[PDB]
Design a protein around this ligand. Sequence first.
Ligand SMILES: [Mg+2]
Ligand SMILES: [Mg+2]
Ligand SMILES: [Mg+2]
Ligand SMILES: [Mg+2]
Ligand SMILES: [Mg+2]
Ligand SMILES: [Mg+2]
Ligand SMILES: [Mg+2]
Lengths: 118, 206, 62, 153, 262
Amino acid sequence: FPMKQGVLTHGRVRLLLSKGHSCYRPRRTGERKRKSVRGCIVDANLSVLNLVIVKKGEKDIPGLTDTTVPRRLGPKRASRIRKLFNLSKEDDVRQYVVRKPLNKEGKKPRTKAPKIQR
Amino acid sequence: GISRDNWHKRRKTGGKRKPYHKKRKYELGRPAANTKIGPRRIHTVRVRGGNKKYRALRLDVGNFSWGSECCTRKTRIIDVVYNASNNELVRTKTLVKNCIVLIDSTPYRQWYESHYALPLGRKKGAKLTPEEEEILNKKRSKKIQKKYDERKKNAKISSLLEEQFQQGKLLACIASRPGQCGRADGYVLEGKELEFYLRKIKARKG
Amino acid sequence: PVARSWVCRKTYVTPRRPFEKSRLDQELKLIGEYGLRNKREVWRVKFTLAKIRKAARELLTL
Amino acid sequence: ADIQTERAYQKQPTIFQNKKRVLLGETGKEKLPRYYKNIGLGFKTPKEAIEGTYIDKKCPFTGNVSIRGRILSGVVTKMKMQRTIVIRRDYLHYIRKYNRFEKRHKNMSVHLSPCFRDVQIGDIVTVGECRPLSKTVRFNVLKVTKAAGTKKQ
Amino acid sequence: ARGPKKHLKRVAAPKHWMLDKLTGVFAPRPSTGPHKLRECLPLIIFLRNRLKYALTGDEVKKICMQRFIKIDGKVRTDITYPAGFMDVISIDKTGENFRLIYDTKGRFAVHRITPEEAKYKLCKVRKIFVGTKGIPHLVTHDARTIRYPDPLIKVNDTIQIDLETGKITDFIKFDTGNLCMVTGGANLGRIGVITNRERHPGSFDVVHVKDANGNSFATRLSNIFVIGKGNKPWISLPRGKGIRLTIAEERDKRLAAKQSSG
RNA sequence: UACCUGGUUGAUCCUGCCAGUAGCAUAUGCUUGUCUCAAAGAUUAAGCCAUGCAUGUCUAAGUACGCACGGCCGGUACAGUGAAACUGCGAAUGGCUCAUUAAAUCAGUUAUGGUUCCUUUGGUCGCUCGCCACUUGGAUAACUGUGGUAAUUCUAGAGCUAAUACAUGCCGACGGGCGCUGACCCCCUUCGCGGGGGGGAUGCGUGCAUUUAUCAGUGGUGACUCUAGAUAACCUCGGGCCGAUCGCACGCCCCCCGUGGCGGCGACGACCCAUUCGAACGUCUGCCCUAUCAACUUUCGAUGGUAGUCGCCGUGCCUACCAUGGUGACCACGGGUGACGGGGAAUCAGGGUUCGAUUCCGGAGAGGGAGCCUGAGAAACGGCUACCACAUCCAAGGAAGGCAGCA
RNA sequence: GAAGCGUUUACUUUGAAAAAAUUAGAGUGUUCAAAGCAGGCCCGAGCCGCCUGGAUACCGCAGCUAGGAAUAAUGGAAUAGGA
RNA sequence: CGUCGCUACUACCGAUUGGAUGGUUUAGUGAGGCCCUCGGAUCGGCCCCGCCGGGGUGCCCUGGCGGAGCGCUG
Ligand SMILES: [Mg+2]
Ligand SMILES: [Mg+2]
Ligand SMILES: [Mg+2]
Ligand SMILES: [Mg+2]
Ligand SMILES: [Mg+2]
Ligand SMILES: [Mg+2]
Ligand SMILES: [Mg+2]
């Protein structure tokens, strides 16, 4: 059972969960359902603990602080492109969009660009 | 939940009626707003048909009309002093449709001074000189004085009313329904209605 | 539900009393004369005549 | 007594009680205006409701009720409720099998405005249908007629 | 039920649709529109059962989706559009125009009209009021409302809507001596001249109408649709001229027709 | 087709029932060649259910950076087909059953001038003077990648990425007009006074909808406290509107020019009005058996009045204060019903007597109650929550149910 | 042509409004019939299509409308408070 | 014709504070939902005001790192 923020206990509680709270997605509009959840307090009674490195250490962890992976796809909104490349006004904002190339083995490789909105 | 249905009542003959269905939604009832006096808190509620109703949980300002002067101003609520339905409503200070309340007389006093150019709400005068001296005189022209003494000749206030103005508080009866509209609009008491409510206040205490 | 019709009627009426020699002989004479299969044919034509007479009686009283 | 007999203040909502009475109009108790309306359907508003002082929010003529639907008649039976009376409607129910009739009656709680001042038990009152005035009241008295009386010994 | 219905039974459909029992359990529940469903003729049955253009609902759907039907001058792709009384169904691809009018037996008849007659449509006003800014608004028996009408038009009078503009060309006052038509009840589909209107306050007023044969029939006011001034209709009347014949005369008319054809 | 016949006596006329006789409607027995229609787990058990299915959905016109395909014509935002997912809508209809229910449901009638109403259709959408607008902000799916649990249509952590999702928010029309506030100025009976009127500088509000109070009396009813006017104001930060939307052909103006301005046909979206589909509560009359049910109702609302609360609205619907009322042999109240109501069915001189679970209309229910979310519409059950009773899986920590839908 | 009846009803007649299905019943050779709501006509082949129907009746009691006024109930002027 | 004698059957009375199943209820406890008053695990904005670049010309246009106000707030 996943642990939900704000429970403030060790163990499990049953909670009535609405749309977009956590740990539950609704099968129809307005549906709520009582679900078992784990408290936010960490203890030994636990299987997997999710942790996020917010500060780097003096050394490099092997397989973690290396081989940087990109974001799978760049900005799509015109304003997002503008803030990504510091466009001011009409400086080829249309063609400044990142255009990703894709190379499949059994076909002629092609480069494709997403439609830009707004 | 709460039911507004007629079928849970005994019939006219006094016989017990048996229901033929369980409670429907359209015959629902919701908890009373119980409008207190204080900083504004309005809770929206979705009602039948997707419309919206306003629950005035707390109200500190109101819109009240003099009526006799046709002067409507946004004033503030002091406290509820009398309620015809329930005496407990007065002690718990809840605004309902017909309850009477004490309201500030400052905007009405200001309008009276600006229009009739006569002292009202003042005890003896010569205490607010930077403003009252200007507003009373204005050294205005011949025709402007001709239009001021024209409205002066019919400028009179009921004795029960200018005394309240001196006190700074006016008795006002609400006319809106807080908890249905989310407002506490009303009208200032005058004449026989004011006299009757004052006698009711005196009989209750005094 | 279904788009059936189930509108039907009996085309004959059985006699009130069975085993009358006169009625049995008269119906058998009709059957022999007109080659009828059984008593239901003579009963159905008798019922048709009775319905016609009933409608005519209603119109006559009208 | 007066018209102020309860914890609240009685007044006709459409009438402004205060008109800024000043010296241009003599303050010798100028009469407050009275709101009355014709209800139609050939019923004349009584002069008592025309010039009376009573306040009745359920009166057909001076109140906020509209007559529409069915107009019927009854005979006054009891007069023991505040501003409302019960009438009896006698009719005949036809029983087909015996080809005969059957006396049966229905009571009706109708609203009596104070304009009709001297109604007595047994007089015939015509009432008109209105919106539900109370739990069992759906009719309002429109006209009153005496039952072979008008002469009391 | 917990909400609005969206199904109609074949046997619960209006009788004048001439819907037979055996073909289907259901009926084409008309979509909401200008006219009530009890007195409207859906386009599907108009094109499938009245003109026999289509065989089934799919065929009539294809006709509708190819945008040939112009109800009231507007292309309507709804298969169950409520046509209603005195509406123009124009198929320009065939160059044919239909004015939906009740026949003698109180049911809509296929009424072919000329293109120069198909450009206007009479309407019976239903309510008159004044909206914001003191603007006179006028609604009709359809859901059609118009602004700035002639102040002479009162309730249950007639107006001439000019198509493609939605404006007024002329009007007919409702009074004695005006040719009209009954649009409901036992006398539905009968053409006559108003002779009397008796008033029952708080109740439905009743009018007495005399046709060309002199037969006098009464009806309610709400069922009266004036369609002409005096004794001359403003539109082409259907066959029979809205003259009701009892069973005997139509029987012998059938006999005469068969005898002349044979 | 308005019908009778046998049976008490030693015999006879009667009363009188028994039996016979005909239909139809459930079952059962025996038999059964053709063909057209056609009822069918209602009766006891609204008892319990394995399994499978019964509600999903895309046009040119909301959002494609899946290679999942594919035109690339090759220097380009976006060809196109498009899975998935977000968004919108539906899922409140239908189908089933008849347990409940006896002025209740329901049928005719009438009202809503006492209410709400998705959607369709028609109005209205520059009516408001008030350094992004050549277009603003943040997140989240789908997608890559790390998983947990025995398990489920369970989901967490990390990384992006869109809107007609969620917010934000101008310009324009816009020149002004109107009503108050009125510096002053001008013509006046002029004369030693008032003067009778005009312009007007500066500010305050201006539109629709909402909530008050007040004045007069464009259209409308049988009847408004109607609609429409006028004034003073308010106008709810989980806070009303005043288009930051989407496709199809592509064109016109060039003076100032030459880079901008104009443009048609639609779609979608709108506060409000009308219409359509309705819905909800009311009006009058109408229901089987029972007195071995005669007096009921009123502490705990029973009947009415006053003022509120709540509701979509009218009402004891509820609350507070009053009054003592209200219904009954013209059968109240209570009880029973092997009672869902009606259209209808059987029988067929006339009159009636029985039957209507059953395909149409209306009501109710989804094992029994109860409470809610979303939504225009549900007290929804092929939605959720809890209890009661049944009952499924389990690694014993948990998890999952509702065939009076078709089989 | 606008308004009232020199009472109020009961009763009778008329008209409106009364879902469909079912019932009676009109028409129509389903091969006859139960049914169904269809169908028929000339074609010498160009009939580049014509003629139709899908009625009507009943629908209680209660309510609405307009005629009649015999039967039955109901009342008007007796301390005249009469027209 | 009736008692008595035999045998079958059907209801009736009957200790058992007999039992069961419905329904309406008094009094008490009371799940859960909704509403109200709180609550604030967290997630954001401004004040940045510790640095640097700076700019009409340290008198910053600000673009970042970043102490952090240890405040005002959603
Ligand atoms: Mg876009
Ligand atoms: Mg039952
Ligand atoms: Mg039934
Ligand atoms: Mg049903
Ligand atoms: Mg919706
Ligand atoms: Mg239900
Ligand atoms: Mg449920």
